[PDB]
Amino acid sequence: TQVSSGQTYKITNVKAGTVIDLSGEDNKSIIGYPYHSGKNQQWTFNWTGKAWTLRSASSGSYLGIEGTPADGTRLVAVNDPFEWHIWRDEANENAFRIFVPFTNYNLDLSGYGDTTPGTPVQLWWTWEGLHQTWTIDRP
């Protein structure tokens, strides 16, 4: 299925089954959480002409990062649009990886896809670990 600029999606970890969630505890931390159709679990995609931005349907903040890209950098809500590269996974064409542009750092559900609600979403160097792959589909 198609992913289109202007549309809003939930983003589900292939390993864990939890979704990318803007924590209701602080409205800042990005975590894995069971899907309940919350608007803090919905992300409005925009194609800027060169990359993707992801805007929280609940807060209007954007999906971004805490500090310079590194293994373990936390994803956080940020004020300004933050650009991502989004590609189909090489092994699993149904899923995606979400990269900091022009780097090898992609979104990674921490603890190797720990299913625990509240597990942080982080950056990590790209590799086959399934906790780095995500489905993108309608809420």
Ligand SMILES: OC[C@H]1O[C@@H](O[C@H]2[C@H](O)[C@@H](O)[C@H](O)O[C@@H]2CO)[C@H](O)[C@@H](O)[C@H]1O
């Ligand atoms: O804790 C992450 C979790 O937060 C939920 O929001 C809670 C929040 O934790 C609580 O502090 C606030 O006072 O009540 C909210 C509703 O129970 C989110 O609903 C969930 O999606 C996660 O983000």
